[PDB]
Amino acid sequence: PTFVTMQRKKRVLQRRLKVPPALNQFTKVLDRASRNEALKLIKKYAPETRKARRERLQKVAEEKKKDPKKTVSTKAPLAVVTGLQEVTRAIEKKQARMVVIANNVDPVELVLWMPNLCRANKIPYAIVKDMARLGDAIGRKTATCVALTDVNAEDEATLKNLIRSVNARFLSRSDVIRRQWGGLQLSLRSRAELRKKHARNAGVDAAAIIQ
Amino acid sequence: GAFMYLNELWKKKSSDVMRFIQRIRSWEFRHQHTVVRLRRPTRPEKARMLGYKTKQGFCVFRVRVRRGGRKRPVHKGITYGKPKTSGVLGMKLNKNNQAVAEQRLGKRFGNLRVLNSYWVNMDSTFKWYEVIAVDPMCKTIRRDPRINWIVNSVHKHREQRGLTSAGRKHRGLRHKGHKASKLRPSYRAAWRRNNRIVFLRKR
Amino acid sequence: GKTVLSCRKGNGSVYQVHGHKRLGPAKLRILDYAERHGYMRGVVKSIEHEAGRGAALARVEFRHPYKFRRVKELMVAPEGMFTGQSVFCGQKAPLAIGNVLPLGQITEGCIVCNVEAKPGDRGTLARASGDYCIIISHNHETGRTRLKLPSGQKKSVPSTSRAMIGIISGGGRIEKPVLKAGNSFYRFRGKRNCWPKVRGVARNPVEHPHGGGNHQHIGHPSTVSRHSPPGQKVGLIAARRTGRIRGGKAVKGAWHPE
RNA sequence: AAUUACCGAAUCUUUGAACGCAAACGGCGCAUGGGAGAAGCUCGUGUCAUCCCCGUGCAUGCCAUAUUCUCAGUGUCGA
RNA sequence: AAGAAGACCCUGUUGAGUUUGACUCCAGUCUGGCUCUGUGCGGCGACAUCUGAGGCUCGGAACGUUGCUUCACUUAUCGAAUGAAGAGACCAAUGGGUUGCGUAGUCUUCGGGCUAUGCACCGUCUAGGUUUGGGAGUCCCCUGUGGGUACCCAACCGUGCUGUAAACUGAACCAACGGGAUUGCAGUUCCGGAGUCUUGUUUCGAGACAUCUGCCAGAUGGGGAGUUUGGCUG
RNA sequence: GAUGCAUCCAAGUGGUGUAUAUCGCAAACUGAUUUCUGCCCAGUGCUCUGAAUGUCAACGUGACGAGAUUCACCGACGCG
RNA sequence: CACGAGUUGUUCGGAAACUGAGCACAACGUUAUAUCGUUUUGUUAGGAAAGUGAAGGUGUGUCGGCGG
RNA sequence: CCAAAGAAGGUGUUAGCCCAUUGAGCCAUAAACCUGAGCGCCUCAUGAAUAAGCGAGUAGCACUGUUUGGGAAUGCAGUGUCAAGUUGGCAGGUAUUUGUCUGCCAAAGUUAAAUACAGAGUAGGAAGACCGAUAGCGAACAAGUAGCGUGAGCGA
RNA sequence: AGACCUGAGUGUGGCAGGACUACCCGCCGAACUUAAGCAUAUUACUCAGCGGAGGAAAAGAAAACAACCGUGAUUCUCUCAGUGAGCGGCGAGCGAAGAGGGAACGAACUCGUUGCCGAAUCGGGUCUUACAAGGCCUUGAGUUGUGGCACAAAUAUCAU
Ligand SMILES: [K+]
Ligand SMILES: [K+]
Ligand SMILES: [K+]
Ligand SMILES: [K+]
Ligand SMILES: [K+]
Ligand SMILES: [K+]
Ligand SMILES: [Mg+2]
Ligand SMILES: [Mg+2]
Ligand SMILES: [Mg+2]
Ligand SMILES: [Mg+2]
Ligand SMILES: [Mg+2]
Ligand SMILES: [Mg+2]
Ligand SMILES: [Mg+2]
Ligand SMILES: [Mg+2]
Ligand SMILES: [Mg+2]
Ligand SMILES: [Mg+2]
Ligand SMILES: [Mg+2]
Ligand SMILES: [Mg+2]
Ligand SMILES: [Mg+2]
Ligand SMILES: [Mg+2]
Ligand SMILES: [Mg+2]
Ligand SMILES: [Mg+2]
Ligand SMILES: [Mg+2]
Ligand SMILES: [Mg+2]
Ligand SMILES: [Mg+2]
Ligand SMILES: [Mg+2]
Ligand SMILES: [Mg+2]
Ligand SMILES: [Mg+2]
Ligand SMILES: [Mg+2]
Ligand SMILES: [Mg+2]
Ligand SMILES: [Mg+2]
Ligand SMILES: [Mg+2]
Ligand SMILES: [Mg+2]
Ligand SMILES: [Mg+2]
Ligand SMILES: [Mg+2]
Ligand SMILES: [Mg+2]
Ligand SMILES: [Mg+2]
Ligand SMILES: [Mg+2]
Ligand SMILES: [Mg+2]
Ligand SMILES: [Mg+2]
Ligand SMILES: [Mg+2]
Ligand SMILES: [Mg+2]
Ligand SMILES: [Mg+2]
Ligand SMILES: [Mg+2]
Ligand SMILES: [Mg+2]
Ligand SMILES: [Mg+2]
Ligand SMILES: [Mg+2]
Ligand SMILES: [Mg+2]
Ligand SMILES: [Mg+2]
Ligand SMILES: [Mg+2]
Ligand SMILES: [Mg+2]
Ligand SMILES: [Mg+2]
Ligand SMILES: [Mg+2]
Ligand SMILES: [Mg+2]
Ligand SMILES: [Mg+2]
Ligand SMILES: [Mg+2]
Ligand SMILES: [Mg+2]
Ligand SMILES: [Mg+2]
Ligand SMILES: [Mg+2]
Ligand SMILES: [Mg+2]
Ligand SMILES: [Mg+2]
Ligand SMILES: [Mg+2]
Ligand SMILES: [Mg+2]
Ligand SMILES: [Mg+2]
Ligand SMILES: [Mg+2]
Ligand SMILES: [Mg+2]
Ligand SMILES: [Mg+2]
Ligand code: NA
Ligand code: NA
């Protein structure tokens, strides 16, 4: 079917051409081990579902219905920041300890600028393999980005170790990331054709050497 | 907010990264149909400015139009009458291509109402416009005060009457005052004002 | 004026091929895997005449390489092909008349017909009756074979293109004088509506550039430019020379630097 | 139950955008409801094969939707 | 005499058919530029910075950028074919892989990278041909007949290869069989018989040109359109 | 010699000769056979070479000027 | 002209139910505009247009053979 | 004799009083419409007592074409090229480069009335210094009828 | 295994197609004719053609006029004005705008953006006499952003 051919051909054209660094940086993702650790932490601080939020809100009114003179907070428990608008505000306000960004957002212009914004505010960040896996951690279908603003005491060590790991791959490698182009990758048949051609003409010009 | 970064990124259309993104998309759109339904807009920041919302009853379609000047459809390129009307290849359509794209979409799908449209990509032979359409029978549309107006029958096929933003553009309606006196409220209306012979009862 | 007849025929209409009673396009078998790596054996079932074509046609029965059924392809018969003959098509086919071989497997000087201009086009060159190509040489560096076309032109094609060994049957057809308008009538009955031919000077000036005059004459040179628009491009189109050819008929067509 | 006038309740053949498929054919279907059935089986009553009659659904496109229906992809992942 | 507001001739600032070296133009054709339009290796210039060494001319790099151009390439594109029916590799890089480890430099946010350069992985199986090691089984019925044994491994080539090398008309499908689980035999199974893999393209040819697409520009252009083709005058 | 020639068409992945492939297709002239078909390329057509071979656009390149403007160079068929 | 009548089919002709020169619905493309183009050289459409079903497994109905 | 009625139709000749008309007023009502945003009930809503930005293949500009009274270009279209936002941008009707002033803030959307009905319809009404059966609509009448043409149409 | 991205099949609930077309909106678009000829011009941004609505349509809340002592969305009327504007083989011809007197007018609002919030949002079931602008439930949609508050007619809003 036409859509099957086009999605396969689209992948080919994204490796044959010369990919500018602003796009090639999204193919250089965090390693599998730290990606699993990051998603595990995000899952632990997942936002409360519709059911949980409703029960908490109803209980608050019970306190207020008891004594209307006093005041009871309606704030949600500590959780990761989700949504492009809210994650962006957390970065600009410099509240996020670490940002997790997905690498397959289409259109990519939604998050193409985010690694530069995180670098400009010296906020640790990482680029991970799937926006669907990011959604599973927060209990949604997909998620463009997730920001952590704070964690509990027992998880501070994990967050600090996580920050060090993502800093090695992304924040400390800013000079490499800003300059590394991608693409220009030959096909297997083209590579094999080039390999066999060199092997055919390996020692043809030997007699032209004085030595 | 995040809009500002999205908006300023789309102002660097000639940069290395944006040309690469558009080159891939233009190649993909070349191998698609003239009219294609999308789940989400390719430019959510641009679509929202033009009235799109992520609600039930909002639909986005990508429409393709062929580029170039209009060729007069005369047999064998033979015209008659005065030589002033002898041109075949050099005349231009008095309607812009964005308005043509909206009219093709609205004429094909009569159950929808065309709201607005925007430029997404170009190519040597094709121009792509994404058109925002609204379903008038949807309950979400019918109960939303911000979009309720489009249900009324006076807005049926408003793109065929040049009432959209692109239609207003080629009507000269972006201008007021001394730059638009002869075309307001329309060219025909001003012509009627200036050319009807008036017979007062006592003259 | 009015539309010239030569331009009117581009609409088709009553000037199209008389395709009824034709057996279909004549082609070699598809350049499949068996052809590319081994050979396929077929049996000539019949030799038939098709209306409008001088050369005889052959129905060759092959087995389906993948399914349990027969194929029964139809190709232009070379001279000497007979019913019950075994036909070999493929890489390993022996050099014999009626066999189809890759051009790179055919020796210098072998006479071939039904030559593929492009690999896999199922035969496009040397197909008219009595016609054939002559293989000049092969070049193993670039994988191209050079052949002499029936018009005398020299052309190079990929060595993977297939050719049939022999000459096309039905030669000598043009050497018999027709002798009768009725015989010309039956000849074009199977081809198309193009006969009889009325001279342009015999038409009226509204219809043809050559029409009109108190004498039947072309009042202007009959050699016309290559850039003249349709309706003006009648006569001798872009002629390099005119008059009787003396001392050798040069090869006609356009010069190719190859 | 006069006859007029007006209008809330009804009827409304074959068609036609005409839309199950066609058409100088009052033609021919696939589903699902019925009806009549002097053959056959059953005790003139029941039931009823083939045949016949009637109702409803059945064009294409688009939108929304699925107690969250069934799928496809050398798309991206994850086991 | 009738039949028709002379058909000949002239006039009108009335036409129309046709022609062309009329006037003014339009399609078509061709041509240039831009664009479509990508990668890498060179060559020849221009500019910039600095220098010649003779008598404004001429010659140098070395860092950059760029106007043309050679060659190699492939993903845009174009041309064919096919029921998109068997591509390439395994034969191994100037290859990919932090969903590997070293060495030497050079950076670091101290977490780890970047440049070269090794090693190891991805990663591998074969018809046939030639010649190196190894082990291992003619018998029944009557001179005849029937059944059966003359193998595996390794290296080299080869490259996916069970049939034809003068042709006269055949049949072939919906698997046997062997393993692994659940003496032999039979169920439900996978496995191979029918090799595996995919930085991916249906295949072939061409290929960043081509008129391939649009735009701008110029020639040509009764093929076609519109119009004109004075006046005086025995 | 098919990415062809002729050519339809307002336009496309459009159309015809072409279900074809030089013993073919398309365009002209003459007009069976027989015997022949002389001279002329100055003219007008058609057709084929110069790498500076003059001129002819747009685009490009540089320069004076505050800039519009202007100037110089480059520039293909075609004509010569 | 007026009034009143007449046309009877399992097998006759047509249709149900064939293909031909051909047409052009869908699909796709084009056009400011579909009222345009393609649509038989085995044959639509960048094209996922088959709702039909060998054999099995699993129940029912008409048989068969075996032993109890 | 009536007239708050003289009003024009009908009736066998010219009618205020022969008939019907011509007025207060009476009766009946789906919803909608109007009325301390009419007035109750339940339900649901609801009023009063510190910095940042503001619409991009868009506006411009070039070429071509068209349109305009718009004239070194009034709008628009195609292609090429394509911004600003650090007193920014647009307009200020002779092109350019400067620096002062004035007004306004494009490139997203809705909106009643006053206006049209130059060969339309529905339900009603009021008329005319108009025509008066070769007139006035083609049609005062079984008129878009009869009839004609293959047809588009023509048409008493 | 599964996910979500893209794309299909079917069921369920709907909508489009045609008619009308006087007026109105968008495109396309002549020629007769006038110039005592004719090509620019004129007829005319008209007829014919193709689309699309409504009781009207379109326009409409200043990137507007002006240059004043200033006016203040749109539309229409008289006038400006057949113009000491302008366009034009500067020929034939063509040709508006601001201001002023009036009609109308309760005339103004919404989104995007920016800040502060953030699923408070939408559908679908179900209940209340109720396909409630209501309660409850709902992964179904939606965080690739639905809604809320404040942006010069403004100067807090949010609980009581
Ligand atoms: K003929
Ligand atoms: K004839
Ligand atoms: K002549
Ligand atoms: K002849
Ligand atoms: K058609
Ligand atoms: K005009
Ligand atoms: Mg959130
Ligand atoms: Mg004309
Ligand atoms: Mg006005
Ligand atoms: Mg006026
Ligand atoms: Mg007037
Ligand atoms: Mg014709
Ligand atoms: Mg003749
Ligand atoms: Mg004659
Ligand atoms: Mg002629
Ligand atoms: Mg003659
Ligand atoms: Mg002659
Ligand atoms: Mg029907
Ligand atoms: Mg139908
Ligand atoms: Mg998969
Ligand atoms: Mg006379
Ligand atoms: Mg006369
Ligand atoms: Mg006259
Ligand atoms: Mg005179
Ligand atoms: Mg005539
Ligand atoms: Mg001409
Ligand atoms: Mg002429
Ligand atoms: Mg005279
Ligand atoms: Mg052809
Ligand atoms: Mg001749
Ligand atoms: Mg002779
Ligand atoms: Mg001569
Ligand atoms: Mg000559
Ligand atoms: Mg210049
Ligand atoms: Mg009679
Ligand atoms: Mg009778
Ligand atoms: Mg065809
Ligand atoms: Mg047929
Ligand atoms: Mg068919
Ligand atoms: Mg096809
Ligand atoms: Mg009276
Ligand atoms: Mg009364
Ligand atoms: Mg009240
Ligand atoms: Mg703005
Ligand atoms: Mg622009
Ligand atoms: Mg004009
Ligand atoms: Mg202009
Ligand atoms: Mg212009
Ligand atoms: Mg409006
Ligand atoms: Mg009166
Ligand atoms: Mg009369
Ligand atoms: Mg009359
Ligand atoms: Mg009459
Ligand atoms: Mg007139
Ligand atoms: Mg005149
Ligand atoms: Mg005159
Ligand atoms: Mg005249
Ligand atoms: Mg009209
Ligand atoms: Mg009104
Ligand atoms: Mg309106
Ligand atoms: Mg005003
Ligand atoms: Mg005056
Ligand atoms: Mg005018
Ligand atoms: Mg006023
Ligand atoms: Mg006024
Ligand atoms: Mg509810
Ligand atoms: Mg919002
Ligand atoms: Na044909
Ligand atoms: Na009432």
Coordinates of C-alpha atoms in Angstrom, one line a residue, chain A residues 11-91:
Chain A
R11 CA 13.3 6.8 6.6
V12 CA 15.7 6.3 3.7
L13 CA 15.7 10.0 2.7
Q14 CA 16.4 11.1 6.3
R15 CA 19.7 9.1 6.3
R16 CA 20.9 9.8 2.8
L17 CA 20.8 13.6 3.0
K18 CA 22.9 16.0 5.1
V19 CA 21.1 16.5 8.4
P20 CA 21.9 19.9 10.2
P21 CA 22.9 19.7 13.8
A22 CA 19.6 21.2 15.1
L23 CA 17.9 18.0 13.9
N24 CA 20.7 15.5 14.2
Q25 CA 20.9 16.1 17.9
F26 CA 17.6 14.2 18.3
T27 CA 19.1 11.0 16.9
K28 CA 21.7 11.1 19.7
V29 CA 19.5 9.8 22.6
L30 CA 20.2 8.9 26.2
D31 CA 21.4 5.3 26.7
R32 CA 18.9 2.5 27.6
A33 CA 19.9 2.1 31.2
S34 CA 19.5 5.8 32.2
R35 CA 16.4 6.1 30.0
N36 CA 14.8 3.3 32.1
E37 CA 15.9 5.0 35.3
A38 CA 14.5 8.4 34.2
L39 CA 11.1 6.9 33.2
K40 CA 10.9 5.0 36.5
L41 CA 11.4 8.2 38.4
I42 CA 8.9 10.1 36.2
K43 CA 6.4 7.3 36.7
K44 CA 6.8 7.5 40.5
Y45 CA 5.8 11.2 40.3
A46 CA 3.0 10.7 37.7
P47 CA 0.2 13.2 37.8
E48 CA -2.9 12.1 39.6
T49 CA -5.7 10.7 37.4
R50 CA -9.2 12.1 37.1
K51 CA -10.4 9.7 39.8
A52 CA -7.7 10.6 42.3
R53 CA -8.0 14.3 41.8
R54 CA -11.8 14.2 42.2
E55 CA -11.6 12.3 45.5
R56 CA -8.9 14.7 46.9
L57 CA -11.0 17.7 45.9
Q58 CA -14.2 16.3 47.5
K59 CA -12.3 15.6 50.7
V60 CA -11.2 19.2 50.8
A61 CA -14.7 20.4 50.7
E62 CA -15.5 18.2 53.7
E63 CA -12.8 20.1 55.7
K64 CA -14.3 23.4 54.6
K65 CA -17.8 22.3 55.3
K66 CA -16.8 21.4 58.8
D67 CA -15.4 24.9 59.7
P68 CA -15.9 27.5 57.0
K69 CA -13.8 30.1 58.9
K70 CA -10.5 28.1 58.6
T71 CA -8.7 27.5 55.4
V72 CA -7.5 24.2 53.8
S73 CA -5.2 24.0 50.8
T74 CA -6.4 22.4 47.6
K75 CA -2.9 21.9 46.1
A76 CA -2.0 18.7 44.4
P77 CA 0.7 16.4 45.7
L78 CA 4.2 16.7 44.3
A79 CA 4.4 15.5 40.7
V80 CA 6.3 16.1 37.4
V81 CA 5.4 19.0 35.2
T82 CA 3.7 17.8 31.9
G83 CA 2.5 19.6 28.8
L84 CA 4.5 21.8 26.4
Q85 CA 3.1 25.1 27.8
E86 CA 3.9 24.2 31.4
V87 CA 7.2 22.5 30.7
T88 CA 8.3 25.6 28.8
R89 CA 7.3 27.9 31.7
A90 CA 9.2 25.7 34.2
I91 CA 12.4 26.1 32.1

